[PDB]
Amino acid sequence: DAVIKVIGVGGGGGNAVEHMVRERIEGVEFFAVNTDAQALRKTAVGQTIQIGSGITGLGAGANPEVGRNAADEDRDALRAALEGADMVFIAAGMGGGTGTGAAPVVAEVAKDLGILTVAVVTKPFNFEGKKRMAFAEQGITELSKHVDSLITIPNDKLLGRGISELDAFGAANDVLKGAVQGIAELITRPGLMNVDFADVRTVMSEMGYAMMGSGVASGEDRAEEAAEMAISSPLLEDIDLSGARGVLVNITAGFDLRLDEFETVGNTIRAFASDNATVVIGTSLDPDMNDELRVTVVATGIG
Ligand SMILES: Nc1nc2c(ncn2[C@@H]2O[C@H](COP(=O)(O)OP(=O)(O)O)[C@@H](O)[C@H]2O)c(=O)[nH]1
């Protein structure tokens, strides 16, 4: 079976991976990497990796340098946790000290082991201030040198009263989960048209920027409607699919998913994509879905 590891780095990334643990992603192994020993005690994520001593200067933990130095000190533990994976996902909320600085170290450890590495990260809300935004962008520059594909979700693009801080980050958590689940479950729980992992590697390895959209529909034309909804999703509104060197598509549904629906989704995606590129369409089986069919589209090698 495939070995797929999902690593939440820092507080924001740990929170996103905790959401993935609660909502489930089939067949993946979850890890939390953090300088914050208290966060590692509290997390429901089953495997934790302490980086650095866990002993803090006041406000020192906000510098990405602290997260970078901590991860570098514990590169042996990172390597030992990642060794043997077929794919690694790195989730982080960029802008703090630990995610921003440690996530590129985790990514490079995986890259140097030869593991297909995909990062799905957020940028801070503008209200968090320019300093955090500058830290985040510098961290994304560094992360981009060490990953195969990078999906960057600006919190400002996703999102009132009754909206708590917990609720505000829940929106990001759902998108990060959708990207990880959409890619991984093609491998860990295939449906009638099983994707070949070499096709996943083809569209994700050393590709650069990527972006995800998703849609879901029920009824007679569910396949068309879900695919069209994914292409028209707010995250892909600015990305022409025919500018993507790769396109990965996950159709998720129950036992009733039909070959004609696979063909229809493929026709729709190929209508919008280019043909000087590589397209990969796979399926996942979710036995608890009745009526509904979800389409997740990951455009890779955009720029
Ligand atoms: N998804 C998510 N993002 C968060 C959360 N808390 C903060 N963030 C975002 O992630 C960034 C860094 O988070 P923080 O906990 O301060 O530092 P970290 O330990 O390096 O992750 C922040 O600037 C926020 O944009 C959270 O609970 N969930």
Author numbering: 10 to 65, 67 to 169, 173 to 316
Which text from the study accompanies this structure?
FtsZ, a bacterial homolog of tubulin, assembles onto a ring-like scaffold called the Z-ring, which serves as the foundation for cell division by the divisome. The N-terminal subdomain contains the binding site for GTP, and the C-terminal subdomain has, by analogy with tubulin protofilaments, key catalytic residues that contact the GTP in the subunit below to initiate GTP hydrolysis. Strikingly, although E. coli has provided the most detailed understanding of the machinery and mechanism of bacterial cell division, the structure of the E. coli FtsZ (EcFtsZ) protein has remained elusive. Here, we report the 1.35 and 1.40 Å resolution structures of E. coli FtsZ(L178E) bound to GDP and GTP, respectively.
Du and coworkers focused on one mutant, L178E, which they confirmed to be assembly-incompetent in the presence of GTP. They also found that EcFtsZ(L178E) lost its tendency to aggregate when bound to GDP, as determined by size-exclusion chromatography. The EcFtsZ(L178E) protein, which previous studies had indicated to be a monomer in the presence of GDP or GTP, produced well diffracting crystals in the presence of GDP and, when optimized, permitted us to collect data to 1.35 Å resolution. One clear solution was obtained, consistent with the presence of one EcFtsZ(L178E) molecule in the crystallographic asymmetric unit. In spite of evidence that the L178E mutation in EcFtsZ inhibits assembly, the crystals showed that EcFtsZ(L178E) assembled into straight protofilaments, as noted in the previous study of Du et al.. However, comparison of the EcFtsZ(L178E) filament with the SaFtsZ filament reveals that the EcFtsZ filament is much looser (see below for the buried surface areas). While the residues in the EcFtsZ(L178E) loops from residues 63 to 70 and 168 to 178 make somewhat similar interactions with neighboring subunits to those observed in the SaFtsZ filament, they are more surface-exposed in the EcFtsZ(L178E) crystal filament and their relatively high B factors (the average B factors for residues 63–70 and residues 168–178 are 56.9 and 45.5 Å2, respectively, compared with the overall average protein B factor of 23.9 Å2) indicate they are somewhat flexible. Presumably, as the residue corresponding to Leu178 in SaFtsZ is wedged into a hydrophobic pocket of an adjacent subunit in the SaFtsZ filament, the similar burial of the Glu178 side chain into the hydrophobic pocket in the EcFtsZ(L178E) filament is predicted to be unfavorable. As a result, the EcFtsZ(L178E) protofilaments have a more open subunit interface. Our analyses show that the EcFtsZ(L178E) structure adopts the R state and as such has a closed cleft between its N-terminal and C-terminal subdomains.
